[PDB]
Amino acid sequence: PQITLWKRPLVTIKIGGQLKEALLDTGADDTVLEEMNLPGRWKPKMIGGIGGFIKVRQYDQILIEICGHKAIGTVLVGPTPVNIIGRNLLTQIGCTLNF
Amino acid sequence: PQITLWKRPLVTIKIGGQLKEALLDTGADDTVLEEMNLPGRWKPKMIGGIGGFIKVRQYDQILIEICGHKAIGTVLVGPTPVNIIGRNLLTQIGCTLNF
Numbered sequence: 001p002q003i004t005l006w007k008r009p010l011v012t013i014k015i016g017g018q019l020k021e022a023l024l025d026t027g028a029d030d031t032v033l034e035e036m037n038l039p040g041r042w043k044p045k046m047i048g049g050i051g052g053f054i055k056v057r058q059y060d061q062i063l064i065e066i067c068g069h070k071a072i073g074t075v076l077v078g079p080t081p082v083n084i085i086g087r088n089l090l091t092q093i094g095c096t097l098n099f
Numbered sequence: 100p101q102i103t104l105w106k107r108p109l110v111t112i113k114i115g116g117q118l119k120e121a122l123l124d125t126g127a128d129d130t131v132l133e134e135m136n137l138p139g140r141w142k143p144k145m146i147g148g149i150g151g152f153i154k155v156r157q158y159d160q161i162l163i164e165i166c167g168h169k170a171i172g173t174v175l176v177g178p179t180p181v182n183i184i185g186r187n188l189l190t191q192i193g194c195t196l197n198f
């Protein structure tokens with residue numbers, strides 16, 4: 001589909017057997033999701049933006065479905081105020097910017 | 100143009116007569132640029148990101164050209180980690196997400 005930007009580009013995602021709302025975010029290198037108790041191993045990471053850094057848990061090869069489009073890649077989990085779909089997964093669903 | 104997302108969507112902007120590089124950021128409501136001198140009046144504002152809140156100077160009705168497309172809108176100036184073009188201007192240049 002085509003998503004205009006009058007409002008936040010929020011879409012439904014499915015990860016770890018849960019449905020959530022997330023931003024399609026061309027400004028994020030990687031995907032960051034609200035705190036959730038995912039199984040498996042993880043590595044600590046710190047990511048920075050406006051206001052400073054937050055601590056997140058990096059999970060690899062996580063399956064995510066975005067608007068019925070399947071993807072698999074790195075997912076960072078931590079105290080983010082919003083679920084953020086980053087370019088690492090946006091490329092996998094064929095998402096582009098157009099103007 | 101059509102911009103794929105395997106690299107950061109960085110473009111050249113013109114603001115205040117000066118060329119800069121900025122990130123097309125669909126996850127940003129607002130446009131936030133690194134510290135710089137801009138003509139005209141401004142007002143102190145706050146904006147929150149993934150890591151907390153920062154103080155910014157809000158410039159309204161500023162002329163800014165983004166990848167050859169003209170916009171006139173609000174530009175916030177402050178200690179953002181990178182220049183980001185937010186939805187307030189992405190809408191003006193007719194930018195959409197497509198997959």
Ligand SMILES: CC[C@H](C)CN(C[C@@H](O)[C@H](Cc1ccccc1)NC(=O)O[C@H]1CO[C@H]2OCC[C@H]21)S(=O)(=O)c1ccc(CO)cc1
Nearest residue numbers: 027028029030047048049050082126127128129147148149
């Ligand atoms: C360094 C370039 C951007 C600032 C990066 N951000 C993505 C950005 O889209 C965030 C994503 C975002 C969106 C809402 C709340 C917190 C973060 N939006 C944002 O900060 O926008 C601000 C400016 O407009 C306002 O609208 C939203 C907040 C204001 S981010 O959230 O901080 C970020 C995301 C992912 C990683 C790991 O790669 C690192 C940083």
